[PDB]
């Protein structure tokens, strides 16, 4: 009887940050309420000024990470304002039935809907838009995110002992397929609907023009680098709604990885690189042991360093010479 | 001494159905006899009327699923009638030696051969044609299928308790590479041999023109949708003989998945999407909990909704509002 | 205190062979010293005489396999002679900090450097060149290899019992992207630097022109086939520094596979085919049971038989008819 359960309202934050939550559940099951507003907007995705018409949940690519516990109810109010032009919906891979909620959430511009589902399976899961006849176009225009359903007693290692993270980041990786003219220049369109048939042709090549983290080439660099300190335990959630990726922390490892993101399974240990299949979210836990700049990449290095799938951590603290040292610096 | 073992003759059925078998072995080891006849035939693969010269085992793409138990002997009579034009053979990934039987089964049109092998390893496995110098052409023309070798005591969960399926379906996913003229129109050929050099060039792009389930775009839809009922336990065997795929049940999960298809390993639990590498068969077990239409896709959504890798389940029974419900239907 | 540890100098051997080592450690932790010399050289990669400017560690593609034990120190002297033209470095995925050593090992032609790191995590790991702004170009020109960090007590099966290999081979798989003129003919260049902008354009297609084992189409065939005997236990280490692969032994299996190469995890059993993600090394253990020719392939069969990713084992000994036999040889 759901009317007797506590309700809690959560305000979502922009990726790669994550809203505040408890790892170990401090209450019984709740109905957790979220609101998202669909925004169709122009996005500049690279250093050259290439623009697309992005389709977003809450104004960002990816959409924000939602965090609940196993056997909570998720109640989502989804708003499609009349400033948009397209019909949208939402499919949660975490949910059971009705095409993951897609069949129940079709909203024209000017409409809203509220869906509730029970989070019965622990893990990270993709959510994405999926309107009949236009599914890949929506998804590859940026309309995807993830939801983390924590076990009520938090995360566990391969022996069942507690694993506790100090920080958590969300990396959404996005494949874009920007249409090109005959010579290979990217095309521009006034509206999203203009691009439709050129978008289909670009997608059918199966060759993305850009692969980015957090919506743009270089989005997780500079002043937007991820930060941590030596000794901190960091959880990195990584989603790809459409195409396989293979994350790698340059200078580190995945100490504990759930590559396909489902926490009832034991993690894989000591990974150099792991495969997250398209349509999946995964999670990697790492304890930093050395200070400095780290790069976090898709380890198809072309996709990383030419197409955009690379970000940075900046880590503070003490250098450990036992782990690594230059015995003879580069010299003639 | 094989002459003292019982012999049983099995008649194969068309995919996505599977011949009758026992999950838990009701007899000791047997020699299980199968016959397959190679058919080269014209196939229409999409709604536009694109035709290829398919190369098939038993007239279907994929070839039929064979089912035996661990330590049975498989005896296959392979017939290549003189109405075909090409040399064929068979390679079982389940078998040990002689290129999986490929070296022993080369049959010109007008010839037959009988191979026997012992099924020493439990799991689902690919089989495919593999004639010297023309291996990918045969495979990507549809000449592949799968064989399931059940443990003698049936399937087990991650704790070693019995898992029993009520229904079993076989989904063969096929990458096709249809040659195109300069403008991008699909070419046509009177005979398979005509296509050879254009087929090689099309394959070398590594970009399939169509990716389909059960031999055609929309083959597992409409009146050919897969069916189940709420509460039924369904095993879905999925093979891809040449290229990676990432199955996903839209509105459901893989409760227990053997992504690389080998049953001595514990299954992965609660999967949203799983990766079956090319040259592998995998298996996913799901208990349906909600009625309605489900879509089963390769979750590269371009491959699914543009190139053809999507089918449907239609599930009957009672809706459960506790799992999912529309709190406020789409409204202005 | 590292000055009190024994030092041992190892001389590396050309792939696919591996330098002599102990499986179970016969000493305490050591500093293990290796030298590698960078060689930029012309390489013929296919039967047609296509040439590239390869960038190599120690003259080979892949670079040589290094073998140490968990908690040894690796000390590498890296030499870039003044006959080379480019700046190089090395990144070990086995190492912790400084971009896997990349930040500390930048060597112009005419320079050398010595790096030491502690091998804290057991497994096979990729190493590769990774100079700032030119990472994929170096890697896809062949500048990668692998390092195996054995547990001090050797390898273990899924139950923790010892697994001992009689032979070990290293297969480096390399994706090349040879630039093409308008008609599709491969281009030629006097120097590596000439190719730079054409190399970037070729890479951005994400479509390799050649995928090879040990640096050339057909390198592991003929008199260079891998050898074994019936009853031998063989470990095959396989790396791919940039792109996913799916190894398969034709006529055999992976009895025990660490697909992502990290030995603290239990192996997967009875694999037909396994996925090694790009930027990973994996390892497969097999006991041969039948004599004859086996092919070891990437089971995207186009990549194998058209693009070059295939090699051979030749296995000697006794044929076992119980496992497989021709009951009726091919006949009219
Ligand atoms: O600015 N809206 O695509
Ligand atoms: O956009 N309707 O609230
Ligand atoms: O789905 N593409 O890896
Ligand atoms: O091909 N998937 O990155
Ligand atoms: O190890 N960095 O690609
Ligand atoms: O999907 N389990 O990591
Ligand atoms: O109709 N045979 O290709
Ligand atoms: O086609 N020979 O039976
Ligand atoms: O083998 N192609 O995923
Ligand atoms: O790229 N494999 O679907
Ligand atoms: O969740 N359906 O792509
Ligand atoms: O291959 N084991 O699922
Ligand atoms: O011959 N050096 O590229
Ligand atoms: O190339 N310097 O030793
Ligand atoms: O990274 N390509 O499989
Ligand atoms: O697409 N990787 O072989
Ligand atoms: O089974 N050989 O591709
Ligand atoms: O990465 N473990 O096989
Ligand atoms: Cu949408
Ligand atoms: Cu989906
Ligand atoms: Cu054939
Ligand atoms: Cu095969
Ligand atoms: Cu280099
Ligand atoms: Cu790397």
What is the number of alpha carbons within 13 Å of residue C277 lying toward its C-beta? Answer: 22
Q: Same domain for A49 and A10?
A: yes
Where chain B is broken, by preceding residue (C–N > 2.5 Å)?
Answer: none
Chain A residues closer than 8 Å to C110 by CB: 332
Do residues A262 and A292 make contact, with C-beta atoms less than 8 angstroms apart? no
Q: Is residue C328 part of a domain?
A: no
Q: How far is A178 from B321, CA to CA, in rounded Å?
A: 41
**DSSP-based three-state secondary structure for C76:** strand
Of residues C40, C46, C72, C91, which has the active-site annotation? C91
Find residue A239's DSSP bridge partners. A172, A281
Q: CA A38, CA A56: separation in Å to the nearest integer?
A: 6
- What single string gives the DSSP state of each residue in B206-255? T--SEEEETTBTTTTSGGG-EEEETT-EEEEEEEESSS-B-EEEET--EE
CB atoms inside a 10 Å sphere around CB A319: 13
Residue B46: helix, strand or coil by DSSP? Answer: coil
Active site residue A210: no
Structure tokens given for C135? 């990472």
Q: Which long-range contacts (CB under 8 A, 24 or more apart) does C194-198 make?
A: C195/C53, C196/C137
Over its C-alpha atoms, chain C yields an Rg (Å, rounded) of 20
Residue of C64, C15, C61 lying closest to C42 (CA atoms): C61
Instruction: Let me know if A248 is a catalytic residue.
Output: yes
Distance CA C167, CA C155 (A): 14
SS3 C217: coil
Answer whether residue A330 is part of any domain: no
Judged by CB atoms closer than 8 Å, whether chains meet at A260 and B244 is answered as: no
Shortest distance, CA B128 to any CA of chain C (angstroms): 11
* Same domain, residue pair B4 and B86: yes
Q: Which of A230, A178, A231 is nearest to A208 (CA)?
A: A178
Q: Are C23 and C164 in contact (CB under 8 A)?
A: yes
Question: Looking at ligand 12, which residue's alpha carbon is closest to its atom 3?
Answer: B258
Q: Evaluate the omega torsion of the peptide bond into residue B325 and state whether it is cis, within 30 degrees of 0.
A: no
* Dihedral angle computed from the Cα positions of residues C291, C297, C299 and C301, in that order, rounded to the nearest 10 degrees: -110
Query: Best mutation site among C252, C330, C331, C332 for testing chain B: the one with the most B CBs within 10 Å?
Result: C330
Half-sphere exposure in the Cβ direction for B285 (13 Å, CA): 20
CB C32 within 8 A of CB C75: yes
Q: Which residue among A124, A151, A178 closes a domain?
A: A151
Q: What is the DSSP string of C174-214?
A: EEE---B-TTSPBP--SSTGGGHHHHHHHHTTT--SEEEET
Residue in the structure block whose two tokens are 């990885």: A257
- C163, two tokens: 């697994």
Nearest CA among B105, B107, B125 for reference residue B116:
B105
User: Is C331 domain-assigned?
Assistant: no
A117: which chain B residues are within 8 Å (Cβ-Cβ)? 323-325
* Chains within contact range of chain A (3+ C-beta pairs < 8 Å): B, C
Q: How far is CA C326 from the centre of its chain?
A: 37
Concerning whether C138 is annotated as a catalytic residue, the answer is: yes
Interface test with C, best of A287, A294, A302 (most C CBs within 10 A): A302
Distance CA B231, CA B224 (A): 21
Exposure on the CB side of residue A34, measured as CA atoms within 13 A:
24
Is residue A52 domain-resident? yes
Contacts of C166 (CB under 8 A, 6+ apart): C232, C233, C234
**Residue C106 is assigned to a structural domain of this protein:** yes
- Cα C21 from Cα A271, distance rounded (Å): 24
List all residues 6 or more positions away from A284 whose beta carbon is below 8 Å from its beta carbon: A235, A236, A238, A247, A249, A254, A255, A256, A257, A258, A271, A274
* CB of B205 closer than 8 Å to CB of C300: no
Resolution in A: 1.7
Spatial distance between the Cα atoms of B214 and B221, rounded to a whole number of angstroms: 11
Let me know whether C2 and C114 are in one domain.
Answer: yes
Radius of gyration of chain A (CA): 20
Distance separating the N- and C-terminal Cα atoms of chain C: 77
How far is Cα C299 from Cα C284, in angstroms, rounded to an integer?
15
A152 — phi, psi (to 5°)? -55, -25
Which of A37, A260, A273, A287 is catalytic? The answer is A273
Q: List, in order, residues 6 or more apart from A204 with CB less than 8 Å away.
A: B302, B306, B307
Q: Which is nearest to B148 in space by CA: B278, B244, B245, B22?
A: B22
Ligand 18 close to Cβ of residue A268 (< 6 A)? yes
Radius of gyration of chain B from its Cα atoms, rounded to whole angstroms: 20
Q: Kindly write down the DSSP assignment for every residue of A163-201, as one continuous string.
A: E--SEEEEEEEEEE---B-TTSPBP--SSTGGGHHHHHH
Task: Judge contact between C288 and C231, C-beta under 8 A.
Answer: yes
Could you give the CA distance from residue C59 to residue C62 in angstroms, rounded to a whole number?
A: 9
Instruction: Return the ligand number nearest the Cα of B192.
Output: 7
Q: Which chains touch C (3 or more CB pairs under 8 A)?
A: A, B
- A162-163 and A155-156 beta bridge pairing: antiparallel
Which two tokens mark B255? 């409760």
Ligand 22 centroid–CA B251 distance in Å is: 33
Pairwise CA distance, residues B46 & B216, whole Å: 6
Is position C329 within any domain? no
Give the Cβ contact number of residue C231 at 10 Å. 12
d(CA A237, CA A285): 9
What is the whole-number distance in angstroms between the Cα of residue A277 and the centre of ligand 4?
9
User: How many helices and strands in chain B, by DSSP H and E?
Assistant: 3, 22
- CATH number for the domain including A59? 2.60.40.420
Q: Is A93 annotated as contributing to ligand binding?
A: yes
Length of chain B: 332
Chain length of chain C = 332
> What is the H or E stretch that residue C301 is in?
helix C301-305
Phi/psi-derived region of residue C142, left when phi > 0, alpha when psi is between -120 and 50, beta in every other case: left
B323 and A97: CB-CB below 8 Å?
yes
- Tokens standing for A100? 């993951």
Whether ligand 7 lies within 6 angstroms of the CB of B192 is answered as yes
Please report all neighbours of B, defined by 3+ CB atom pairs within 8 A: A, C
Q: Other C-beta atoms within 10 Å of C132: how many? A: 12
Rounded Cα distance, A304 and A313, in Å: 15
Claim to verify: residue B310 and residue B274 sit in the same structural domain: yes
B138 is catalytic: yes
Could you give the 3-state DSSP secondary structure of residue B281?
strand
* Contacts for C285 with CB less than 8 Å, ≥ 6 apart: C155, C163, C165, C233, C234, C235, C236, C254, C255, C256, C257, C267
Task: Compute the C-alpha angle C211/B137/B183, nearest 5°.
Answer: 85
- Residues of chain B contacting C159 with CB distance shorter than 8 Å: none
Dihedral angle over CA of C195, C197, C201, C204, nearest 10: 100
Type and span of the H or E element at B203? helix B196-203
Per the CB < 8 A criterion, the answer to whether C183 and C189 are in contact is no
- Domain membership of residue C84 (yes or no) is yes
Identify the residue whose C-alpha is closest to ligand 13 atom 2: C41
Question: Cα(first)–Cα(last) distance of chain A, in Å?
Answer: 77
Q: Work out which ligand 6 atom sits closest to the CA atom of A257.
A: 3
Chain C positions touching B119 (Cβ under 8 A) are none
**Nearest 10 degrees: Cα torsion C121, C126, C128, C130:** -70
With H, G, I as helix, E, B as strand and everything else as coil, classify residue B124. strand
* 3 state DSSP class of A99: helix
Q: In a 3-state reduction of DSSP, which class is residue B303?
A: helix
In a shared domain, residues B26 and B122: yes
Query: DSSP code of B62?
Result: S
Q: How does strand B7-9 pair with strand B31-44?
A: parallel
Please tell me the residue having the least CA distance from ligand 15 atom 3: C244
| B250: CB partners within 8 A, 6+ apart | A91, A99, A100, A102, A130, B294, B295, B296, B297
- A298 is in which domain, residue-wise? 152-318
From A118, A151, A184, give the residue that closes a domain.
A151
H or E element in which residue B37 lies: strand B31-44
- Cβ <8 Å between C117 and A306: no
Question: Is the distance from CB of B288 to CB of B231 less than 8 angstroms?
Answer: yes
Q: How many CB atoms are located within 10 Å of the residue C3 CB?
A: 6
Separation CA B82–CA C84 (nearest Å): 61
Dihedral angle at the C-alpha atoms of A186, A189, A193, A197, nearest 10 degrees? -40
Does the annotation mark B273 as catalytic? Answer: yes
Neighbouring residues of the ion ligand 23, judged by CB less than 5 Å: C 55, 88, 129, 138, 143
Q: Which residue has the tokens 């759930």?
A: A258
Q: Is A110 in the pocket of ligand 2 (CB under 6 A)?
A: yes
With tokens 């599914």, the residue in question is A135
Torsion of CA B52, B55, B60, B61, to 10 degrees: -70
- Paired residues of C280 in beta bridges: C240
Among A151, A171, A186, identify where a domain stops.
A151
Ligand 12 pocket member B164 (CB < 6 A): no
First-residue to last-residue Cα distance in chain B: 77
Are A142 and A184 in a shared domain? no
Chain A residue whose CA is closest to B247: A279
Q: Is A273 assigned a catalytic role?
A: yes
Which tokens in the block code for residue B227? 């069916």
Please give the distance of CA A4 from its chain centroid, rounded to a whole number: 33
Bridge partner residues of C226 (DSSP): C313
Q: For residue C169, what are the β-bridge partners?
A: C236
DSSP H stretches of helix in chain A = 135-140, 196-203, 301-305
With contact defined as beta carbons under 8 Å apart, do B224 and B310 qualify? no
- The residue whose CA has the least distance to atom 3 of ligand 5 is A250
**Largest Cα–Cα distance of chain C, in whole Å?**
77
- Given a contact cutoff of 8 angstroms between Cβ atoms, the answer to whether A259 and A268 are in contact is yes
Examine the domain organization and report whether C192 and C146 are in the same domain. Answer: no
Instruction: Please tell me whether residue C101 adopts helix, strand or coil conformation.
Output: helix
Q: Report chain B residues whose CB lies below 8 A from the CB of C331.
A: 111-113
- Report which secondary-structure segment, H or E, holds C302: helix C301-305
DSSP state of B72: P
One-character DSSP codes across A5-44: S-EEE-----TTS-----SB-SSS--EEEEEEEEEEEEEE
C76: left (phi over 0), alpha (psi -120 to 50) or beta: beta
Kindly tell me the sign of the dihedral angle through the C-alpha atoms of B312, B235, B298, A139.
positive
- Mapped onto helix, strand or coil, the DSSP state of residue A266 is coil
Evaluate the CA torsion angle C228, C231, C235, C240 in order and state its sign.
positive
Mutate to test the interface with A, among B272, B275, B297 (most CBs of A within 10 A): B272
Is B27 domain-assigned?
yes
* Bond from prior residue into B16 cis (ω within 30 degrees of 0): yes
C226, C314: one domain = yes
Contact across the interface for C113 and A329, Cβ inside 8 Å = yes
Domain count, chain A: 2
Please check whether residues B94 and B160 belong to one and the same domain: no
Beta-bridge partner residues of C76? C34, C115
Closest chain C CA to residue A330: C113
Indicate if B204 and B277 belong to the same structural domain: yes
Instruction: Identify whether residues B54 and B160 lie together within a single domain.
Output: no
Same domain, yes or no: C173 and C105? no
Q: How was this structure determined?
A: X-ray
Strand-pairing partners, residue A111, are: A80
Chain A residues with CB-CB distance to C115 below 8 A: 324-327
CA distance C42 to chain B (A): 25
């Amino acid at each position: 009887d759901i009317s007797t359960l506590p309700r809690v309202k959560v305000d979502l934050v922009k990726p790669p940050f994550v809203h505040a939550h408890d790892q170990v559940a401090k209450t019984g099951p709740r109905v957790v309420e979220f609101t998202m507003t669909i925004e169709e907007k122009k996005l500049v995705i690279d250093r050259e000024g290439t623009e697309i018409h992005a389709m977003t949940f809450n104004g960002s690519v990816p959409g924000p990470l939602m965090v609940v516990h196993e056997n909570d109810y998720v109640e989502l109010r989804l708003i499609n304002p009349d400033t948009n032009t397209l019909l949208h919906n939402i499919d949660f891979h975490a949910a059971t039935g009705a095409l993951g909620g897609g069949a129940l959430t079709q909203v024209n511009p000017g409409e809203e809907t509220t869906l509730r589902f029970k989070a019965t399976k622990p893990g990270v899961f993709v959510y994405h838009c999926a309107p009949e006849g236009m599914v890949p176009w929506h998804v590859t225009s940026g309309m995807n995110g993830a939801i983390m359903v924590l076990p009520r007693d938090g995360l566990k290692d391969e022996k069942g002992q507690p694993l506790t993270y100090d920080k958590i980041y969300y990396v959404g990786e996005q494949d874009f397929y920007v249409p090109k003219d005959e010579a290979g220049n990217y095309k521009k369109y006034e509206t999203p609907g203009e691009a439709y048939e050129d978008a289909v042709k670009a997608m059918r090549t199966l060759t993305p023009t850009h692969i980015v983290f957090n919506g743009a080439v270089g989005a997780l660099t500079g002043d937007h680098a991820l930060t941590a300190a030596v000794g901190e335990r960091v959880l990195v959630v990584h989603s790809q709604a459409n195409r396989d990726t293979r994350p790698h922390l340059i200078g580190g490892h995945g100490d504990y990885v759930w590559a396909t993101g489902k926490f009832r399974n034991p993690p894989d240990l000591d990974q150099e690189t792991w495969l997250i299949p398209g349509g999946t979210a995964g999670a990697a836990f790492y304890t930093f042991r050395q200070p400095g700049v780290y790069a976090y990449v898709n380890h198809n290095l072309i996709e990383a360093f030419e197409l955009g799938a690379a970000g940075h951590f900046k880590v503070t603290g003490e250098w450990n010479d036992d782990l690594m040292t230059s015995v003879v610096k580069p010299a003639s």
